[PDB]
């Protein structure tokens, strides 16, 4: 809708609540609002008042030591968009040290344009982790929310579910909650930044956040770009001018604000490019009749004066004060203590300056990576100097790698010396390149630039070592390179070789295990020169590695340290045959099949093509064919470095002193299977209850002939059948003429393995169980069984067969009456 309320420039509230009563008819705030230091308050003093008309904060909102407020939604239930023209240590919402605050309640926010949110040190705060800040803010990695009750403890966040949308923040769909009875509004992604209505329809293109009617420029709650009489517009039409990047004013408003500073004590407003601007930039001037920035002839810059010479740049709210400057009166002390990348906002704020009268000092900055945000820095004058006569000071910059890019950039340092200490990713070649570009070569004294602190973590050796002769094997690499000599050859201590395995190609520079190399012996001729190399040994087959060679040297401060290094190249082992396929286990379900299970071996060696599984039926043992198991013995198997640096320099010092003192001037086809892409194989079509020979090989190459591994041997046996050992067929008798019974039966032709014994349980009626053992040779001798010398009567003969697996089934009792020779 429209804006019911007055313009309301930003005031400051302190120590009693009487000046909070001036926010009745306020729709927007042009400025910052700081509700701070509220000591003699109660929770009964805050719930009886509300200001629901307020919609927009331009600069920031600050809360600092306010007692008794348990949620801020009693104050501001309709705060929509925080803009962020001026900031507060690059934040627009600082909530610091709230005692007796438990929840936020700020449900009507979904966009803050420029800045971040830092909430800390609230000792009773909950509902912090249940807000998805990714749809609230743009740079969401510059948030800093820590040290509250919601991360120290595990207070219960009661969420309204039975309705809130469940979004993701790391891996889980948890509901987005503000209070116990207010959901967080999440628009669909077709409404990108324009917002959605209550039914989820996208609003107008100049709407922002909330609209009562979708695709309506008159019904936006907050304008996105500019405001003119209830109509959100992308730009101001003439004669309306832009004002503070949020609204359209006319000529009389900027003229009256010019007259309220010209006839008073301030920001005397001008106009340029149809925008009511505080000051004219460089090349422009101020008239008397009209307020326009007409072009000033000649060199006519913007000159900004610093307060007492020094300005300490610490954040964006100090960087934005020097916006549009070209000539700096004094010295800049850039000290950004950070952890977040602030180079883009410092690029957008600074970089329009040309000349610095004092000195540029960088000190203790962690989060900078370059000093190229000064896009237009030409002349450092050094009229006011750092004590020690330095026009440039660089101490303890942790991640500073490059000063500038010297393909295009250039700097003219007039007076003063140079200073460099504790810059571990910065190199002396870059320091000497800035010394050659700036022309300050013979100006500083010795030990103004540090020699051992700089570049100790960055590999900037600035020489290339070409790998000359590389040959591979199964698990050994012959590495070679061209020989390099520093011009005192005894300062070369050897080669500082580094090795690592490489699953990828984007291996980082500078784990990372090490071997050390003896230096070569030169023969002072260029004929052979003894290309040094290293025989690399003890590797893994079919593994890409990461090989680079750095030169280990001896420091001398009259020159540089020294430097030569090689690029991180990769080498491939290719191999021939893999290792033993392990885990031999033999599972045999049923009687005609055996499944096989195994693990892959330790060498993949390229593609696992197939597993070469061999099987062949092993015959039974010869010694169990003839052994009498009716005899006794019937058991059958049921089947430091610096000391070495000092030693090398001690040898060089002794050769130095000795030369100074002395020289003075005056088949068989087994059944096998190509088992592709499975760790299991059923081997069916078998003989039941016999041994098998199982040979397993891991073949890494199939098509340009079969290369297979060394074999693994295991044996197996199936389960016995049910009726293989059961005696089938009737048992017939041959009763002889002298009471001799000769027994004929049909033996099992294909039993479980073999049957070693035939037990006979024969029972006369009126008698007990009598036993007689029939072995295999007893069966072959008597073609069955023979009974000799027995009592007359009817018998009941049951015969079981005892196999290698065990007993079979008993036969039926054959009733026969032998001759009594009495009756």
């Amino acid at each position: 809708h429209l804006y019911p309320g007055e313009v309301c420039p930003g005031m400051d509230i302190r120590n009693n609540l009487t000046r909070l009563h001036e926010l009745e008819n306020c729709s927007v705030i042009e400025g910052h609002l700081q509700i701070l230091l509220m000591f003699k308050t109660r929770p009964e003093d805050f719930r009886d008042l509300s200001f629901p008309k307020l919609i927009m904060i331009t600069d920031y909102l600050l809360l600092f030591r306010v007692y008794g407020l348990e949620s801020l939604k009693d104050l501001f239930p309709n705060l929509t968009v925080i803009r962020g023209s001026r900031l507060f240590f690059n934040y627009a919402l600082v909530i610091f040290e709230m005692v007796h605050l438990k929840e936020l309640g700020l449900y009507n926010l979904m966009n803050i344009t420029r800045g971040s949110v830092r909430i800390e040190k609230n000792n009773e705060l909950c509902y912090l982790a249940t807000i998805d800040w990714s749809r609230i803010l743009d740079s969401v990695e510059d948030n800093y929310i820590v040290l509250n009750k919601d991360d120290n403890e595990e207070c219960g966040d009661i969420c309204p579910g039975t309705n809130c949308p469940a979004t993701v923040i790391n891996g889980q769909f948890v509901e987005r909650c503000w209070t116990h009875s207010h959901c967080q509004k999440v628009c669909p992604t077709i409404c990108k930044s324009h917002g959605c209505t209550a039914e989820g329809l996208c609003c107008h293109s100049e709407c922002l956040g909330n609209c009562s009617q979708p695709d309506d420029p008159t019904k936006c709650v907050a304008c996105r770009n500019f405001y003119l009489d209830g109509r959100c517009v992308e730009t101001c039409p003439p004669p309306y001018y832009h004002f503070q990047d949020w609204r359209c004013v006319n000529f009389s408003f900027c003229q009256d604000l010019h007259h309220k500073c010209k006839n008073s004590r301030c920001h005397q407003y001008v106009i340029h490019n149809n925008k009511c601007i505080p000051e004219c930039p460089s090349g422009y001037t101020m008239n008397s009749s009209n307020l326009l920035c007409t072009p000033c002839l000649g060199p006519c810059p913007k000159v900004c004066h610093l307060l007492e010479g020094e300005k300490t740049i610490d954040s964006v709210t100090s960087a934005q004060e020097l916006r549009g400057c070209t000539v700096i009166n004094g010295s800049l002390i850039i000290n950004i203590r950070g952890g977040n990348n602030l180079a883009a906002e410092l690029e957008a704020n600074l970089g329009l300056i040309e000349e610095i009268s004092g000195y540029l000092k960088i000190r203790r900055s962690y989060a900078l990576v370059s000093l190229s945000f000064f896009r237009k820095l030409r002349l450092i004058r050094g009229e006011t100097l750092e004590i020690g006569n330095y026009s440039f000071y660089a101490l303890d910059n942790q991640n500073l790698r490059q000063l500038w890019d010297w393909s295009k950039h250039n700097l003219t340092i007039t007076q003063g010396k140079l200073f460099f200490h504790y810059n571990p990713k910065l190199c002396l070649s870059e320091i000497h390149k800035m010394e050659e570009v700036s022309g300050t070569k013979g100006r500083q004294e010795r030990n103004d630039i540090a020699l051992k602190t700089n570049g100790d973590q960055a590999s900037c050796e600035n020489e290339l070592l070409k790998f000359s002769y590389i040959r591979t094997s199964f698990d050994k690499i012959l590495l070679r390179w061209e020989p390099y000599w520093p011009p005192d050859f005894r300062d070369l201590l050897g080669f500082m070789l580094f090795y690592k395995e490489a699953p990828y190609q984007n291996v980082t520079e500078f784990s990372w295990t090490v071997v050390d190399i003896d230096p070569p012996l030169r023969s002072n001729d260029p004929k052979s020169q003894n290309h040094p190399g290293w025989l690399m040994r003890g590797l893994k087959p079919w593994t890409q590695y990461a090989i680079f060679v750095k030169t280990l040297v001896t420091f001398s401060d009259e020159r540089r340290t020294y430097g030569a290094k090689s690029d991180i190249i990769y080498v491939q082992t290719d191999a021939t045959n893999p290792s033993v396929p392990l885990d031999p286990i033999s599972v045999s379900n049923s009687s005609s099949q055996i499944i096989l299970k195994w693990k892959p071996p330790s060498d993949p060696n390229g593609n696992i093509t197939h597993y070469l599984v061999f099987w062949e039926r092993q015959a039974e043992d010869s010694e169990l064919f003839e052994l009498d198991y009716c005899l006794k013995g019937l058991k059958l198997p049921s089947r430091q470095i610096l000391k070495e640096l000092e030693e090398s320099s001690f040898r060089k010092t002794f050769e130095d002193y000795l030369h100074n003192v002395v020289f003075v001037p005056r088949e068989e086809h087994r059944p096998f299977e190509k088992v592709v892409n499975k760790e299991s194989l059923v081997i069916s079509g078998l003989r039941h209850f016999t041994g098998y020979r199982i040979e397993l090989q891991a073949c890494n190459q199939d098509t340009p002939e079969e290369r297979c591994s060394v074999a693994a041997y295991v044996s197996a046996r199936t389960m016995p059948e049910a009726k293989a050992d059961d005696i089938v067929g009737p048992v017939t008798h041959e009763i002889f003429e002298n009471n001799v019974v000769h027994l004929m039966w049909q033996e099992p032709k294909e039993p479980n393995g073999l049957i070693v014994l035939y037990e006979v349980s024969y029972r006369r009626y009126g008698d007990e169980e009598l036993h007689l053992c029939v072995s295999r040779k007893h069966f072959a001798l008597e073609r069955g069984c023979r009974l000799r010398g027995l009592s007359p009567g009817n018998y009941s003969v049951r015969i079981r067969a005892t196999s290698l697996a065990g007993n079979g089934s008993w036969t039926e009792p054959t009733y026969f009456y032998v001759t009594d020779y009495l009756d």
Partner: peptide
Amino acid sequence: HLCGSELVEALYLVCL
């Protein structure tokens, strides 16, 4: 460290 026939494999490989 290589005890075995990896030495005579290694001075096959250093001497080609």
